[PDB]
Design a protein around this ligand. Structure first.
Ligand code: NA
Ligand code: NA
Lengths: 329, 329, 329, 329
């Protein structure tokens, strides 16, 4: 009985076995049926800290190599799996943070069976997702921004994706994605689908030597214009509200956005500093948290203040275009 | 919520949700990945009787139709896979019960290897496994015996066979095999893989409107010549030893079989009433349980007594001969 | 399993082995690595007609079941992979054939990534690609036309698609796509990406009990306004030119088109009988081949004549809207 | 078109395209799926010498560094997997050559079965496989012998080892193993699994600037006591029989070892100069070929004579003991 069978049988895995299971998955040695079975089994009983850590290690080792010489290196990313179906603002917040001087390496992917993933949005904005890791790394060093497409850095994710899409439920990959930034990001604004994961993911980041905030927004895996719950690595837990940082509250519905084409249009207007509603406020909130997490500003309020200025300046769109041109070289 | 997704989430399904999941599976509507996921989920958190019975009804509905007017209708069958490599005791016990006057419709299949399964044994004895359902039904009506070859009656199982093989672990389908008698048998001596399945399977039978005994014998999914554990549908669990029904104990080794021709040779001696060793005692034990389960005898003791006489008469061999000829007519 | 290794070693598979290999692939029993190895080996060695037909059967069996009474049932479909990048006219020709009185079940998919696949075009024209299989079946019975979206009918392809995309080269799946119509179409105008596949594919069609024409047009997997090469089931190989059916030749460039948006408007003008250029002639040629293949017209020229009349009448556009509305709640 | 895709398409690679493909593979830039595809394609069409040599250099470049000043430096190694399952005598022959004064750096690995790989045998004899490269290099300089454990010197093989095992068939890596000596050995007795590989591998050796003999013995990838086929770098092809060098012929079966423990026992007796049968003659034959390949003796005959003397003296066992102690120091 190999480690995969043990996992399917629902038995807790020793660190070495957890590592082996993910190594096999990343190596393309596991059939779709057994991959589906092991993911469901792990999701039912709940993956333990040592298991997640071991699987994360297997993923980092299987990743296409990339070394970025800029630090702090910020990632604004979420676990996904919240079901709220809100627009993915992390990508826009990440661009604002980069336009403000923070080195950014945002980790993202395509959305299951919607064109809404961060990778989908960026592609619609002109980003060539096929660009090699070395070119993306050069962009981060020279321009301060880079988008790390999951499938490119972790090839196996191309096969894991359909399995996750079909199962249609949360799996260990929802937790592993944020924890496996392939550029070695050390600063985070990491959103989670449930408050239960705020502390665990913050502790995971701390063990990795990373810093930042783990966030949850009234059900969504991103900061929203409401009573957000946060856990700052090394410090503790606290609430983060819009009024706290000079922003107004808005229902979650105001952050839903629309179809892929509409969101692509919204993105341009937002980055250009033309769109001014709740969507702009939410991007400013996340970017502000990013400036704080990356040490660009000493506080969240100063971070949000800077983010509002940067967003309104339209510099984030100018940066996006520099990025697009850089990759098309 | 979608029934299949609910299953994958690890939630207990309402009875008709369980029916729907199995209906979808048998209809070829579920993808291999989702089928793998929901089978693993159901197995890990444990299938409940009302789910098991509902899925058995859905599977029975997808089978090739066959209506038998005779009742009670007995089946001696098990969940299989106990890896004991025993002689086809239930097949011989079924022939004995039929020779004793009880209408029998024994459900079976081939064994995936050189070892002989019930279908392999009967084929070696002259049974034409290609006989159409209608002909087998006529045999039950006229001769009181029929063998229901799973491959002929359950074409829909081809939709899940590959997934079951690849998972490499037992699933709800192992439980459903004996609960999907295509002739609608209502009396059973149903063997299970382990003691933990005695009660759930007994309740599933009760919910299906059936009667009888669910049995387990020292690792084997059938009654053996040792300490058996049984659950009488509608009553409760109790132990069943050879001595309390007038038989002597014997090790499992004494009940081992081999290939089709070897088992056929043994079957001939046993059914003719010529071989009186442990194999004969084991057949009498299962057939006796069958007589009791069908209400032919008032007790297990009287059932075993009747079975010993029927076996010794050689009449079960005559019945087999007539059955073989009937399918060839 | 064993047959998979045999394929990887470059050996020709027996019919049963080919069926088993594809059955395993579609069932999710093959790891990405072994799937990649098998597909490359098959492609380099050269798939034989008996293998192709056997694998088509395995795929047809794994698909979401759909049975329709309408016959003859026509499909105009291609293997893709010609790298010619011409406008996919098969969809328009199919609508014309249906408007002319032939039951049509056109098999199609989205295109990576022009969004220039048949599914992409129909969606832009108003077709709800999320319609359930049963509803599409009802459309074929009631309206005489249905579009079979590969993603809906072949869910098992979800775990296979990633391997194909990563390999980035043509594989046996290019050949199987046209041979796995989920509605059981029996009449075809099947385009192939290279002349060497005309004969093998015609034999595959015959082995599957289908009829019609396998076509290739100066590099494209569709009939064009030049010297087409054809292999008709039951007749053999021959060339087919526009002039012999009353049409004028035109450069392939005239059949290109553009962006998805341009082709939607293009498609409308063609179906309404407004566009009269080479594109209209090419649609008439394919639709005409369809009428002949299905038995609606006794000759190819008569089929083209009927297609030209139908196109000019605008009835194909009315059919499209009838279909679009049919799928709406 | 990138080189990996070209390989997958079955086209012969230009020398530097082959170097690039292997460089990418060793750098972790190639996905398991594309790696699987290219390995199968290369194996089926047949790797050419210019490709093999280039890939060997790319692999050598990725290995952990190890500079040995002593020259000539001899290696006695094979491609493995011939199926004959004979005892791996190359290790013993290497020790004899070293005891005879030739600097030896024998390249080896484990044998997942019977873990009777060369590394398995040496470990059973006391060698600490965890010894760092520097220590092994010091042993070669001081003792004249060193065993290069592939897993220690080729950490980059972690990017492909999984794919190799998963494919389960021979690939170019079988050929590359003997051609990637991490100490830069320049003299060889290289065994191949089939005679068709003699000339290509001899050319690959010459291309790499190496000298020696490429051998094949009646189905085995080692010199046997029968009609051996040889291709000598800078000399050409010829047959080599035992009688030509003063040895007696013996059936292959006399050269068959046993399990790992039996081989360790036989190895001890041989090195001590105690075993005097065919196994001793076979060791002398290979060691003699090594002496000649390294330029220690003027002919194969004198090389075998020197080898028989050294073997009988027991000096090779004493060397082994010194080596084991040296590593444990
Ligand atoms: Na007798
Ligand atoms: Na005709």
């Amino acid at each position: 009985m190999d480690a995969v069978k043990k996992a399917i049988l629902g038995e807790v895995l020793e660190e070495e076995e957890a590592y082996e299971v993910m190594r096999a998955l990343m190596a393309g040695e596991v059939s779709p049926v057994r991959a589906a079975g092991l993911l469901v089994a792990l999701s039912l009983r709940g993956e333990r800290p040592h298991e997640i850590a071991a699987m994360a290690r297997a993923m980092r080792e299987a990743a296409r190599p990339l070394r970025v010489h800029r630090r702090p290196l910020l990632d604004i990313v979420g676990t996904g799996g919240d079901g709220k179906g809100l627009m993915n603002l992390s990508t826009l917040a990440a661009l604002v943070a980069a336009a403000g001087g923070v080195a950014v390496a945002k980790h993202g992917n395509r959305a299951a069976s919607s064109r809404a993933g961060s990778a989908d949005l960026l592609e619609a904005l002109g980003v060539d997702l096929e660009a090699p890791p070395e070119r993306v790394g050069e962009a981060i060093e020279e321009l301060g921004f880079g988008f790390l497409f999951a499938r490119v850095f972790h090839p196996a994710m191309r096969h894991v994706a359909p399995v996750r899409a079909e199962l249609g439920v949360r799996t260990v990959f929802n937790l592993l994605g944020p924890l496996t930034n392939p550029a070695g990001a050390d600063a985070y604004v990491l959103g989670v689908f449930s408050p239960e994961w705020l502390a665990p993911m913050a502790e995971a980041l701390e063990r990795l030597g990373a810093r930042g905030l783990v966030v949850h927004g009234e059900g969504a895996d991103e900061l929203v214009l409401g009573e957000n719950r946060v856990v700052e690595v090394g410090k503790g837990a606290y609430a983060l509200t819009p009024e706290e940082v000079g922003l107004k509250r808005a229902p979650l519905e105001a952050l839903k956005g629309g179809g892929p084409e509409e969101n692509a249009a919204l993105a341009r207007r937002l980055l250009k500093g033309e769109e001014k509603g709740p969507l702009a406020d939410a991007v400013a909130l996340a970017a502000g948290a990013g400036f704080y997490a990356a040490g660009k500003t000493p506080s969240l309020k100063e971070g949000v203040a800077l983010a509002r200025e940067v967003l309104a300046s339209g510099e984030a769109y100018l940066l996006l275009e520099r990025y697009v041109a850089f990759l098309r070289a």
